[PDB]
Amino acid sequence: KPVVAIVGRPNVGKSTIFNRIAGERISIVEDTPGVTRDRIYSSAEWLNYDFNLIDTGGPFLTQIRQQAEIAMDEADVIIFMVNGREGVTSADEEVAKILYRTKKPVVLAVNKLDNTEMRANIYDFYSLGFGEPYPISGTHGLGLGDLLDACAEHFKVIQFCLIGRPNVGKSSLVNAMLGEERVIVSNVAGTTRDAVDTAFTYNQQEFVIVDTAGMRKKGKVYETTEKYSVLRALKAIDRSEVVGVVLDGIIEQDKRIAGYAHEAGKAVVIIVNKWDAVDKDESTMKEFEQNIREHFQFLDYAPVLFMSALTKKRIHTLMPAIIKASENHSLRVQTNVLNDVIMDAVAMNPTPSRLKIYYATQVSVKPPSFVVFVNDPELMHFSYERFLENRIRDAFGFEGTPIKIFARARK
Amino acid sequence: SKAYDVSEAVALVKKTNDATVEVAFRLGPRKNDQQIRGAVVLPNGTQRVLVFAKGEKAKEAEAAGADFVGDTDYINKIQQGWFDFDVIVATPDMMGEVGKIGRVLGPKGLMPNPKTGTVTFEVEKAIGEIKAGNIHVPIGKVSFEDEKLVENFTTMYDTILKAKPAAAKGVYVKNVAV
RNA sequence: CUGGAAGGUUAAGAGGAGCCGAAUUGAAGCCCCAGUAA
RNA sequence: UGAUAUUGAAUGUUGGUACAGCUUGUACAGGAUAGGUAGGAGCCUUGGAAACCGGAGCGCCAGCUUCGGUGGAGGCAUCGGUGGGAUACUACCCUGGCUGUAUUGACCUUCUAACCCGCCGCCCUUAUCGGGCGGGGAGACAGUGUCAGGUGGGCAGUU
RNA sequence: GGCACAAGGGAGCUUGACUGCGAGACCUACAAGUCGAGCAGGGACGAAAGUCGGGCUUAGUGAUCCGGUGGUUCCGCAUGGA
Ligand SMILES: Nc1nc2c(ncn2[C@@H]2O[C@H](COP(=O)(O)OP(=O)(O)NP(=O)(O)O)[C@@H](O)[C@H]2O)c(=O)[nH]1
Numbered sequence: 016k017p018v019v020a021i022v023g024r025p026n027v028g029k030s031t032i033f034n035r036i037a038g039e040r041i042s043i044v045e046d047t048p049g050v051t052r053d054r055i056y057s058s059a060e061w062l063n064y065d066f067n068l069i070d071t072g073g074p075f076l077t078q079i080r081q082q083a084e085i086a087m088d089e090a091d092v093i094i095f096m097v098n099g100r101e102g103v104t105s106a107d108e109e110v111a112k113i114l115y116r117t118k119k120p121v122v123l124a125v126n127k128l129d130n131t132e133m134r135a136n137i138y139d140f141y142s143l144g145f146g147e148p149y150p151i152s153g154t155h156g157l158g159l160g161d162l163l164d165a166c167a168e169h170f171k172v173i174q175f176c177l178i179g180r181p182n183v184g185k186s187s188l189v190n191a192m193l194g195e196e197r198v199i200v201s202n203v204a205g206t207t208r209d210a211v212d213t214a215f216t217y218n219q220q221e222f223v224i225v226d227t228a229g230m231r232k233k234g235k236v237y238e239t240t241e242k243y244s245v246l247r248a249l250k251a252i253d254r255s256e257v258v259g260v261v262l263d264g265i266i267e268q269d270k271r272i273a274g275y276a277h278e279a280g281k282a283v284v285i286i287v288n289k290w291d292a293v294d295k296d297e298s299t300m301k302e303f304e305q306n307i308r309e310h311f312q313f314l315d316y317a318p319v320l321f322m323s324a325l326t327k328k329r330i331h332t333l334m335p336a337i338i339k340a341s342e343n344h345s346l347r348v349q350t351n352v353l354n355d356v357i358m359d360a361v362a363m364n365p366t367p368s369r370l371k372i373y374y375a376t377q378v379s380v381k382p383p384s385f386v387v388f389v390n391d392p393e394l395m396h397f398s399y400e401r402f403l404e405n406r407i408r409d410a411f412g413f414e415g416t417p418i419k420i421f422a423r424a425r426k
Numbered sequence: 427s428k429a430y431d432v433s434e435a436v437a438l439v440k441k442t443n444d445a446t447v448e449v450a451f452r453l454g455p456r457k458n459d460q461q462i463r464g465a466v467v468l469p470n471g472t473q474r475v476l477v478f479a480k481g482e483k484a485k486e487a488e489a490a491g492a493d494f495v496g497d498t499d500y501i502n503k504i505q506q507g508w509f510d511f512d513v514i515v516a517t518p519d520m521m522g523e524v525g526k527i528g529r530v531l532g533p534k535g536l537m538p539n540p541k542t543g544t545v546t547f548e549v550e551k552a553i554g555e556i557k558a559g560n561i562h563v564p565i566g567k568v569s570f571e572d573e574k575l576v577e578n579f580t581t582m583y584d585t586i587l588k589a590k591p592a593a594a595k596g597v598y599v600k601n602v603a604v
Numbered sequence: 605c606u607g608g609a610a611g612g613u614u615a616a617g618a619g620g621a622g623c624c625g626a627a628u629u630g631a632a633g634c635c636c637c638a639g640u641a642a
Numbered sequence: 643u644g645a646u647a648u649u650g651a652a653u654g655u656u657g658g659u660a661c662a663g664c665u666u667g668u669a670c671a672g673g674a675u676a677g678g679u680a681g682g683a684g685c686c687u688u689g690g691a692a693a694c695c696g697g698a699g700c701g702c703c704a705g706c707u708u709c710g711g712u713g714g715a716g717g718c719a720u721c722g723g724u725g726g727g728a729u730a731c732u733a734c735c736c737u738g739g740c741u742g743u744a745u746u747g748a749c750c751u752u753c754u755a756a757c758c759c760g761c762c763g764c765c766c767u768u769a770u771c772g773g774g775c776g777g778g779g780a781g782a783c784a785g786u787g788u789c790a791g792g793u794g795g796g797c798a799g800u801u
Numbered sequence: 802g803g804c805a806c807a808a809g810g811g812a813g814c815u816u817g818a819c820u821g822c823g824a825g826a827c828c829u830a831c832a833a834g835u836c837g838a839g840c841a842g843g844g845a846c847g848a849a850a851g852u853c854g855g856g857c858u859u860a861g862u863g864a865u866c867c868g869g870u871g872g873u874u875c876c877g878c879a880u881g882g883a
């Protein structure tokens with residue numbers, strides 16, 4: 016399908032426009048430094064036409080600009096934003112230099128004109144020698160009709176996410192997976208800014224991986240609304256069902272990071288990185304294996320996987336691990352069999368003034384969930400609720416997924 | 427190695443020749459917000475100005491000294507031809523219409539734009555006064571006397587400074603090349 | 605778990621010709637070496 | 643757990659600044675195939691100005707920039723427009739370097755004076771405190787005052 | 802709860818399916834909350850007067866403290882601007 020890309024300079028309403036086209040995933044602030052740092056994809060709709068959209072950026076500047084050039088070539092038409100209020104700047108011609116040697120169609124846009132009187136001053140914007148400028152506004156939806164047509168003229172499954180704290184290798188992890196340079200990797204913390212989509216197929220099966228740029232301590236987040244980026248990570252979690260957790264070869268915040276995932280009723284998998292950094296010899300894995308088991312007990316179903324991004328070892332095993340967690344998270348059981356075992360549990364533990372068990376059935380299949388029909392909803396004890404939990408998780412697999420349990424009254 | 431004075435350089439650009447004495451001035455983009463680009467009538471001072479006057483404003487444009495005004499649209503005569511001559515000014519009504527024609531004025535430096543005082547309702551007063559962060563300004567000739575270019579550079583420097591750009595902080599002056 | 609690269613595979617693909625798929629590249633994992641049994 | 647003042651002296655290793663001087667931008671033209679600001683007010687001259695042959699940087703691997711003695715008062719011709727240009731610049735500037743100029747910054751050895759001694763002698767003095775002179779050892783770190791990553795079970799607030 | 806005079810069909814384009822604006826029902830605790838009188842501006846096959854819609858109430862969670870972006874003949878702490 017046709018691909019469209021927008022390029023420009025800091026402070027030109029790009030991310031803003033892209034969001035106005037569709038969605039609000041793109042982060043928006045007001046300052047020179049805070050800009051989208053890498054490519055991101057999406058979908059659009061304009062008449063029968065249905066092209067996508069590529070968003071780019073304006074310390075480290077060579078990388079992002081280079082990434083923009085990557086987009087430049089593989090695109091179909093070119094959107095070249097520019098500001099209208101302050102006329103023509105040096106950076107405009109600077110980028111124009113590469114655009115001239117870019118043998119691609121160009122459609123220019125002018126932003127920051129949100130009132131009829133401001134619609135003028137377009138004659139000056141005739142330097143590029145390009146076509147007709149079409150004004151647009153970000154705060155208001157002005158002048159977009161002419162722009163789109165300008166573009167339409169030349170116009171002819173599961174998802175899983177990875178999270179962690181900043182500076183762990185999560186960006187290096189992904190790019191290596193695809194085996195493609197897709198996201199920026201740096202040795203400084205919080206290099207990535209916002210979540211990035213990536214769609215690919217594995218073993219005749221398509222998948223969608225997502226990054227979340229890492230997260231600092233919750234009292235450590237005092238910046239120019241960099242929580243505005245942190246929430247994007249939260250939305251991403253809601254978007255996908257499977258979450259992989261990445262720790263470097265333990266800090267309590269990592270437990271706290273796992274806090275949101277577990278309560279979300281989303282399958283969660285434990286992953287480690289940088290295994291090459293530490294000593295690697297006989298029976299080394301055990302020390303971590305029980306340390307994570309000892310530290311993390313409110314989760315048990317999570318399988319433990321080992322990989323090292325730099326040397327790229329065991330990375331093949333990671334993908335399959337994800338598939339196994341999937342059906343486990345989407346699986347119903349025959350109500351006859353489920354209730355068949357509920358009593359055995361109570362036969363071996365005839366000590367519930369006394370609770371009574373009559374029925375239990377699977378209702379929610381999206382996340383393994385069930386409901387028990389008892390006599391006294393108050394009479395229970397959380398330990399007993401923890402008892403019936405393990406029994407069922409041992410009768411069948413239900414591994415790598417959480418379980419929610421409900422206890423209705425007799426009614 | 428030596429920075430000459432203003433009273434010496436006017437008498438010396440007599441000797442750097444009938445040539446035209448012009449001034450470069452390095453300004454102090456970061457500061458594009460308060461950039462320094464402009465035009466002002468000159469004291470110690472042949473053009474051919476063609477106007478785009480609309481409505482009644484053509485009636486005062488034909489007596490001030492302009493060569494050709496127009497038949498309210500001769501951009502079709504501008505298409506496929508049009509040796510432009512000196513200066514193009516316009517009025518704030520047909521400017522948009524002329525502008526939507528393309529860059530026949532973009533890389534040729536005559537596009538009407540009301541940031542320069544050239545697109546206004548006073549076309550009679552506009553004919554009579556015209557006849558990387560750098561500004562070029564023709565202040566005069568070689569054959570002018572020594573007291574002409576001093577007032578010319580004084581007027582242009584007072585115009586630049588009168589316009590003390592916002593974000594005045596930091597040095598404003600870098601270089602004067604006469 | 606440990607090296608030493610050899611034996612090929614390169615793996616979904618990345619790519620695609622004819623007609624869904626040519627050639628051509630393509631990490632791991634398989635000792636393909638034993639020591640190791642935790 | 644990193645910065646900054648105590649905190650001083652010389653070696654080399656380098657840096658970063660600025661200041662000069664030299665050189666750099668080959669492109670779809672124009673004797674080839676070069677960045678933001680004037681169509682001249684030619685040069686005779688000179689590793690060739692026709693051909694003519696070194697040198698890099700190189701190369702856009704094309705074919706140029708000048709240091710430039712044969713032919714040489716011959717030569718291209720300021721001069722025009724297969725790219726938005728087009729000369730003699732008033733020439734400013736950036737870019738990328740080189741050269742040196744100076745002003746600092748940092749690592750390597752580091753020496754001693756700093757700052758230290760739950761080291762040994764003498765004196766105050768009858769004194770396992772303290773203090774002053776000596777030696778000795780470590781020596782610019784340590785420790786010491788203010789800014790940033792864990793971490794308190796130590797202290798609260800809480801429905 | 803309709804008997805076609807409210808389930809056919811040239812044009813009349815066409816969500817006035819709008820901008821102004823208002824007497825009663827409610828519940829009558831009120832706030833709130835809802836549903837339907839009455840009128841200038843052309844804005845219609847329109848010519849005689851018919852127009853604030855998909856002919857039972859059934860929605861875009863609460864439309865909000867939701868403003869941080871924007872037009873200002875409003876103020877601006879001694880007078881100009883900010
Ligand atoms: N007044 C006004 N401000 C606008 C308009 N469009 C955008 N802005 C402002 O400009 C800011 C910059 O836009 P943003 O999309 O964040 O830019 P970016 O994310 O850095 N990407 P880029 O710099 O390439 O455009 C926005 O946060 C918004 O405040 C507009 O039409 N009018």
Ligand SMILES: Nc1nc2c(ncn2[C@@H]2O[C@H](COP(=O)(O)OP(=O)(O)NP(=O)(O)O)[C@@H](O)[C@H]2O)c(=O)[nH]1
Binds near residue numbers: 186202291326
């Ligand atoms: N030795 C070693 N280094 C690694 C490994 N994976 C990543 N790194 C390095 O660790 C650093 C972390 O880079 P990056 O992927 O950006 O980590 P991140 O910051 O957690 N991801 P993000 O940028 O999205 O926040 C990089 O310098 C990367 O080269 C690994 O397996 N081994």
